[PDB]
Amino acid sequence: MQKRAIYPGTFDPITNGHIDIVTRATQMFDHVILAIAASPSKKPMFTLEERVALAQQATAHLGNVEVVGFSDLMANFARNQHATVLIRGLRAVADFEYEMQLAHMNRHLMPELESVFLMPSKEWSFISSSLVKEVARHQGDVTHFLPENVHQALMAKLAV
Amino acid sequence: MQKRAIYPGTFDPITNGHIDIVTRATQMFDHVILAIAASPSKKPMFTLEERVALAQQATAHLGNVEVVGFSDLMANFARNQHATVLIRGLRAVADFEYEMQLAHMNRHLMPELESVFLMPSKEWSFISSSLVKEVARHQGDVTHFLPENVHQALMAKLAV
Amino acid sequence: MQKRAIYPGTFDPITNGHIDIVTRATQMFDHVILAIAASPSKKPMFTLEERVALAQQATAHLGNVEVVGFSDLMANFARNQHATVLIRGLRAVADFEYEMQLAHMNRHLMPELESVFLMPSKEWSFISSSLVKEVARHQGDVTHFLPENVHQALMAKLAV
Amino acid sequence: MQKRAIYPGTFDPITNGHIDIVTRATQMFDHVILAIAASPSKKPMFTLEERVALAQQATAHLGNVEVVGFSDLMANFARNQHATVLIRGLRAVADFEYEMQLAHMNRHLMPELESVFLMPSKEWSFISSSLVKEVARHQGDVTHFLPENVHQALMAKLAV
Amino acid sequence: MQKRAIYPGTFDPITNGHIDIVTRATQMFDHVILAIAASPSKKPMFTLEERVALAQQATAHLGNVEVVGFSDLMANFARNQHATVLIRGLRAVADFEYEMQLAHMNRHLMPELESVFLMPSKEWSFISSSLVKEVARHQGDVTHFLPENVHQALMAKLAV
Amino acid sequence: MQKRAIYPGTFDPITNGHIDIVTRATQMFDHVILAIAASPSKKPMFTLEERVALAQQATAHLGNVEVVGFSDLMANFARNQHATVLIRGLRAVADFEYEMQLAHMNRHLMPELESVFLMPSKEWSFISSSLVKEVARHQGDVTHFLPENVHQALMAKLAV
Ligand SMILES: COc1ccc(Oc2cccc([C@@H](C)Nc3nc4n(n3)C(=O)CC(C)=N4)c2)cc1
Ligand SMILES: COc1ccc(Oc2cccc([C@@H](C)Nc3nc4n(n3)C(=O)CC(C)=N4)c2)cc1
Ligand SMILES: COc1ccc(Oc2cccc([C@@H](C)Nc3nc4n(n3)C(=O)CC(C)=N4)c2)cc1
Ligand SMILES: COc1ccc(Oc2cccc([C@@H](C)Nc3nc4n(n3)C(=O)CC(C)=N4)c2)cc1
Ligand SMILES: COc1ccc(Oc2cccc([C@@H](C)Nc3nc4n(n3)C(=O)CC(C)=N4)c2)cc1
Ligand SMILES: COc1ccc(Oc2cccc([C@@H](C)Nc3nc4n(n3)C(=O)CC(C)=N4)c2)cc1
Numbered sequence: 001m002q003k004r005a006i007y008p009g010t011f012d013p014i015t016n017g018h019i020d021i022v023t024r025a026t027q028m029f030d031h032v033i034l035a036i037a038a039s040p041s042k043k044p045m046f047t048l049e050e051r052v053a054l055a056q057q058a059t060a061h062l063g064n065v066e067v068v069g070f071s072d073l074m075a076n077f078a079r080n081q082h083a084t085v086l087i088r089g090l091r092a093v094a095d096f097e098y099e100m101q102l103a104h105m106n107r108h109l110m111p112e113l114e115s116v117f118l119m120p121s122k123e124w125s126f127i128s129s130s131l132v133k134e135v136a137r138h139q140g141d142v143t144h145f146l147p148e149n150v151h152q153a154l155m156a157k158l159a160v
Numbered sequence: 161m162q163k164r165a166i167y168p169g170t171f172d173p174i175t176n177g178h179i180d181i182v183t184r185a186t187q188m189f190d191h192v193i194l195a196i197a198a199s200p201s202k203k204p205m206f207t208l209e210e211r212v213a214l215a216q217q218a219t220a221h222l223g224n225v226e227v228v229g230f231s232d233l234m235a236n237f238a239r240n241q242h243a244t245v246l247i248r249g250l251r252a253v254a255d256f257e258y259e260m261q262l263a264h265m266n267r268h269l270m271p272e273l274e275s276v277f278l279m280p281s282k283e284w285s286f287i288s289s290s291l292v293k294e295v296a297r298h299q300g301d302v303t304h305f306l307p308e309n310v311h312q313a314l315m316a317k318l319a320v
Numbered sequence: 321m322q323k324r325a326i327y328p329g330t331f332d333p334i335t336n337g338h339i340d341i342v343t344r345a346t347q348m349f350d351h352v353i354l355a356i357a358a359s360p361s362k363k364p365m366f367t368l369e370e371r372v373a374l375a376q377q378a379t380a381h382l383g384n385v386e387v388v389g390f391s392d393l394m395a396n397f398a399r400n401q402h403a404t405v406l407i408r409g410l411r412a413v414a415d416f417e418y419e420m421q422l423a424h425m426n427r428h429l430m431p432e433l434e435s436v437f438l439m440p441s442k443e444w445s446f447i448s449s450s451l452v453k454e455v456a457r458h459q460g461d462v463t464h465f466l467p468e469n470v471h472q473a474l475m476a477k478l479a480v
Numbered sequence: 481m482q483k484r485a486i487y488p489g490t491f492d493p494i495t496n497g498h499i500d501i502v503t504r505a506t507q508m509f510d511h512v513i514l515a516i517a518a519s520p521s522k523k524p525m526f527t528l529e530e531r532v533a534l535a536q537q538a539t540a541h542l543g544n545v546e547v548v549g550f551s552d553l554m555a556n557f558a559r560n561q562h563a564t565v566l567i568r569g570l571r572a573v574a575d576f577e578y579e580m581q582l583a584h585m586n587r588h589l590m591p592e593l594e595s596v597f598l599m600p601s602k603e604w605s606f607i608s609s610s611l612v613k614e615v616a617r618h619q620g621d622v623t624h625f626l627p628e629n630v631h632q633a634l635m636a637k638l639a640v
Numbered sequence: 641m642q643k644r645a646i647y648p649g650t651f652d653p654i655t656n657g658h659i660d661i662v663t664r665a666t667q668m669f670d671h672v673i674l675a676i677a678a679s680p681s682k683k684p685m686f687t688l689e690e691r692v693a694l695a696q697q698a699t700a701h702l703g704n705v706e707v708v709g710f711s712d713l714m715a716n717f718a719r720n721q722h723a724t725v726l727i728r729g730l731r732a733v734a735d736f737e738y739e740m741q742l743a744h745m746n747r748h749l750m751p752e753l754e755s756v757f758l759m760p761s762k763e764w765s766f767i768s769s770s771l772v773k774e775v776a777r778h779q780g781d782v783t784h785f786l787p788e789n790v791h792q793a794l795m796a797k798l799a800v
Numbered sequence: 801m802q803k804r805a806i807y808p809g810t811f812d813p814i815t816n817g818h819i820d821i822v823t824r825a826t827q828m829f830d831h832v833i834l835a836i837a838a839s840p841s842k843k844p845m846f847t848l849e850e851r852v853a854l855a856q857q858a859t860a861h862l863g864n865v866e867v868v869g870f871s872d873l874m875a876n877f878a879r880n881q882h883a884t885v886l887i888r889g890l891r892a893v894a895d896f897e898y899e900m901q902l903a904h905m906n907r908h909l910m911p912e913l914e915s916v917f918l919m920p921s922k923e924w925s926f927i928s929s930s931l932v933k934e935v936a937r938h939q940g941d942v943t944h945f946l947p948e949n950v951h952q953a954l955m956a957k958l959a960v
Contacts, residue, residue: 001481001483001508001509001510002481003481003508024594027564027594028483028564028565028594028596029481030481072298073295073298073299073300074298075300076298076299076300084507084508085508090576090580090597092897092900092901093253093573093576093577093733093893093897094254094894094897094898096570096573096576097252097253097254097573098254100252100286100570100599101252101286101287101288101291102291103599104286104599104602105286105287105291105295107599108304109295109300109301114504114507114508114598115598115599116508116596116597116598117570117596117597117598117599118594118595118596118597119580119583119584119587119595119597122584122762122763122765122766123762125762125765126762126900126901126904126905127901127905128901131901131902131905135873135905135909138872138873138874138876139873139876140873140875140876140909141909144908161321161323161348161349161350162321163321163348184434187404187434188323188404188405188434188436189321190321232938233935233938233939233940234938235940236938236939236940244347244348245348250416250420250437253413253416253417253573253893254894256410256413256416257413257892257893257894258894260410260439260892260926261892261926261927261928261931262931263439264439264442264926265926265927265931265935267439268944269935269940269941274344274347274348274438275438275439276348276436276437276438277410277436277437277438277439278434278435278436278437279420279423279424279427279435279437282424282602282603282605282606283602285602285605286602392618392619393615393618393619393620394618395620396618396619396620412737412740412741413573413733413737413893414574414734414737414738417572417573417574418574420572420606421572421606421607421608421611422611424606425606425607425611425615425620428621428624429615429620429621442922442923442925442926443922445922445925446740446741446744446745446922447741447745448741451741451742451745455713455745455749458712458713458714458716459712459713459716460713460715460716460745460749461748461749464748552778552779553775553778553779553780554778555780556778556779556780573733574734577732577733577734578734580732580766581732581766581767581768581771582771584766585766585767585771585775585780588781588784589775589780589781641801641802641803641829641830643801643828664914667884667914668801668803668884668885668914668916669801670801724827724828725828730896730900730917733893733896733897736890736893736896737893740890740919743919744919744922747919754824754827754828754918755918755919756828756916756917756918757890757916757917757918757919758914758915758916758917759900759903759904759907759915759917762904
């Protein structure tokens with residue numbers, strides 16, 4: 001069906017939970033666009049360029065992933081990427097309720113973009129980019145939760 | 161029973177979800193005070209005066225609605241408006257849990273002010289003022305979710 | 321106003337949580353119909369005649385409560401009773417989810433019947449007729465959760 | 481791709497919510513197996529032969545749907561059918577919790593079967609086969625929630 | 641300290657999730673009573689004598705565990721056993737809601753019994769005795785979720 | 801078992817809900833460290849020194865409580881305090897979901913630190929330090945929710 005899926009988010013930084021979801025998406029769809037939202041208003045730890053480079057390196061082993069950045073309305077960027085599948089990761093109820101609101105909003109903005117929720121391994125079901133950054137800024141060991149390239153970049157960013 | 165109900169919130173800006181709730185309240189109670197909290201600390205998109213004017217225009221077709229602004233403790237403002245009914249809208253679990261805490265707190269502050277939860281149409285069960293503003297600031301079409309006067313005011317506010 | 325409200329359920333048996341909710345309803349509506357479903361509850365410990373007599377005695381002090389048995393679809397009975405307000409009690413998240421489904425269904429069946437959710441005192445926010453029956457059947461003290469007449473009828477029921 | 485997806489359940493009876501989910505699945509996968517469990521549902525109102533015939537007629541317009549009965553563990557049937565995608569529908573939080581448990585269990589049983597959660601239209605986000613049956617058995621109108629053939633079979637079933 | 645803790649349930653059958661919770665309890669309290677309810681579970685697959693023998697063998701390596709059958713209200717048995725700590729396991733939101741209701745009820749029945757909630761490993765955070773039984777009865781592999789003796793008894797039970 | 805428990809948080813300011821939890825912990829464990837996180841990035845109302853002094857005065861009647869401040873990773877501070885028990889308070893689902901993520905993270909950081917959740921009285925099940933501060937800054941009466949010393953300090957802080 002030459003299916004194109006988009007997996008959007010801030011990925012600040014991309015975690016093993018995100019790698020898990022994008023890997024599951026590549027096994028299901030022909031082409032996956034991992035889309036990184038700039039979102040400067042949220043004051044990200046890494047620049048958009050840094051996040052794109054980290055995600056490209058962390059997904060280099062998957063042949064059907066394309067990493068790109070965007071500052072647009074996500075649904076407009078998905079239409080412009082010719083995506084018909086919108087990948088979401090399902091971890092907690094609080095995330096699920098907010099994802100339900102976003103999916104109904106995205107369906108009003110682009111009805112042909114089908115929201116699909118994938119479930120990560122139990123190993124990453126309790127992690128987030130925010131939680132990993134919080135632990136790391138207090139010098140806690142987060143090597144288990146991030147791709148090697150990302151872990152070294154996070155340590156460097158926090159070292160000033 | 162000459163019942164007076166208060167429907168408080170930031171209404172920044174008032175949405176079709178809020179119009180739905182206030183319409184249901186006017187069919188049940190003799191007089192409904194739609195109470196707009198100034199809350200400058202939360203940095204609202206619209207000034208309190210702008211929110212009051214938008215809500216007055218959006219509820220002008222309902223004869224038993226009175227739009228007012230407040231900066232007081234909500235329960236003190238409700239007592240001062242002679243309200244005995246406190247209208248809340250019920251959409252998601254995250255909102256419900258926080259509304260439960262506020263209702264127990266409001267009952268300690270003013271036990272005769274009865275919290276009543278009304279449920280909006282399925283059409284507005286996944287929207288919020290925050291979500292509409294987020295979509296609009298990324299140029300997404302939010303005409304369906306707001307009264308006409310509000311939609312034009314929101315576009316003007318974002319146009320700088 | 322001259323609002324007619326209906327508060328339906330199995331009330332098997334009526335608890336202090338139900339008395340709390342029906343009391344709050346009588347403070348805001350002119351007439352409250354406490355509607356007892358003829359259908360068996362998940363138990364069903366008390367017969368309809370027992371449930372009606374217990375509810376009548378336990379609400380006798382409330383001048384604007386009418387206790388009535390019904391066997392139809394609740395909305396069909398609410399319609400024939402000219403009720404325009406449907407009282408529901410909200411204790412927790414599990415309650416909320418199921419009550420939201422029922423409220424959207426009741427609105428489809430009878431749109432002129434408005435669902436209103438009231439919150440009981442913290443005192444009764446963790447009880448149900450089911451829990452009370454399980455504890456009492458297993459020789460636990462439930463005196464605090466019931467009107468005196470219900471406590472007497474429950475002891476009589478468990479003795480035989 | 482040539483992806484084979486399975487959408488299992490009791491479908492007792494198949495509703496407009498199930499038609500919505502199976503339609504979305506046919507738009508993203510080459511072949512969709514709508515798998516009907518031989519096991520009784522919490523009711524079980526319609527026999528397996530009735531459930532299959534109703535689902536076949538209600539999905540006849542979808543060229544890539546195959547309606548099939550099964551009695552094994554769902555994952556055992558998905559495995560023998562060479563399905564690599566497992567379609568689930570997500571309506572609310574109560575659904576989510578139980579579906580998460582089942583998805584982790586299905587991944588343990590058949591890791592090559594990827595669980596995918598789709599969201600139905602807001603129109604069907606508050607219905608289930610169970611709720612439809614309870615309303616219809618109690619003389620309530622459920623026409624809007626069902627395909628025409630199912631509505632006809634349900635009236636015939638309740639008449640006898 | 642000399643704290644006596646009680647960990648009650650049907651344990652039909654005892655799983656690796658229950659072993660995980662009882663092990664954590666033995667690491668913090670001097671004596672742990674693993675209390676098996678004589679009452680049938682939603683199934684009830686194993687008889688009380690089978691449930692006790694299985695739990696005894698599966699906890700034999702833990703020196704401070706005492707496996708005991710009971711038929712009374714749990715709090716009545718905890719009281720007579722001089723337990724001051726009541727062990728509960730928390731896996732998900734559905735568990736949490738019901739456990740909160742039970743904990744407030746147990747505190748009313750026996751205030752000197754303190755409810756303590758422990759979290760199992762992520763490995764067992766999505767299993768229950770009910771789910772294990774449904775999968776095994778339908779010819780699914782549940783070996784990973786059970787102690788070896790329980791796995792052997794379950795195969796023997798399903799064979800006849 | 802000479803058990804040492806740590807009860808960490810921002811306690812900005814310590815409430816009657818926190819006093820309830822720490823009192824339950826002192827009845828179960830030999831020594832309880834009430835650990836106050838500095839967290840200057842969150843812009844606390846009270847300085848770390850003020851929070852420590854308020855908590856010491858509010859827990860002076862409990863002989864086995866030690867109040868200390870920390871700016872470290874919480875798990876490292878717990879190891880350095882020789883704690884093997886981590887006290888958490890369980891009020892709402894939103895808190896529970898976040899507490900589940902923190903407990904799995906804390907278990908990866910310090911597996912021998914056992915997270916234990918205690919449930920406060922129904923009286924404090926709907927309060928938080930944030931909610932009390934919000935009500936107080938709008939001049940609402942919060943005397944019921946705080947120890948006397950804390951209430952007077954909060955009034956003084958808000959009086960400028
Ligand atoms: C499931 O819905 C998603 C998923 C990921 C998304 O990625 C991000 C993350 C941060 C910032 C942005 C910015 C650049 N654009 C954007 N587009 C939106 N935004 N924000 C909303 O707030 C709501 C909405 C429906 N569409 C996008 C956006 C929406
Ligand atoms: C259901 O309870 C509600 C509903 C709507 C409300 O409206 C707002 C919105 C934003 C700001 C304010 C300010 C001006 N006054 C206020 N009064 C409060 N506030 N804040 C709380 O934070 C908590 C509380 C119990 N009472 C009021 C307040 C409370
Ligand atoms: C908030 O909705 C309510 C509230 C209380 C109710 O009372 C009961 C309790 C038990 C049994 C019945 C029987 C006699 N009639 C009935 N009417 C229904 N029923 N069952 C459903 O299952 C679903 C539905 C939407 N309407 C009514 C019914 C519906
Ligand atoms: C998302 O998991 C699903 C989805 C739909 C399913 O369909 C049904 C419905 C009713 C009855 C059955 C019977 C025939 N087989 C079955 N297979 C199971 N069963 N029961 C469980 O209880 C748990 C489990 C993980 N697998 C299947 C089964 C599992
Ligand atoms: C956390 O509360 C618990 C935990 C485990 C328990 O174990 C079981 C399991 C199944 C059956 C029973 C029977 C024998 N006694 C019992 N005691 C109860 N029961 N049932 C209730 O239904 C509610 C309640 C508060 N106390 C006990 C009981 C209560
Ligand atoms: C149940 O887990 C808890 C409970 C209370 C805590 O106390 C606080 C409160 C605010 C600030 C801090 C700072 C000083 N240290 C810290 N340590 C952390 N932090 N932050 C996280 O964000 C996540 C995490 C797993 N460990 C600690 C921290 C974690």
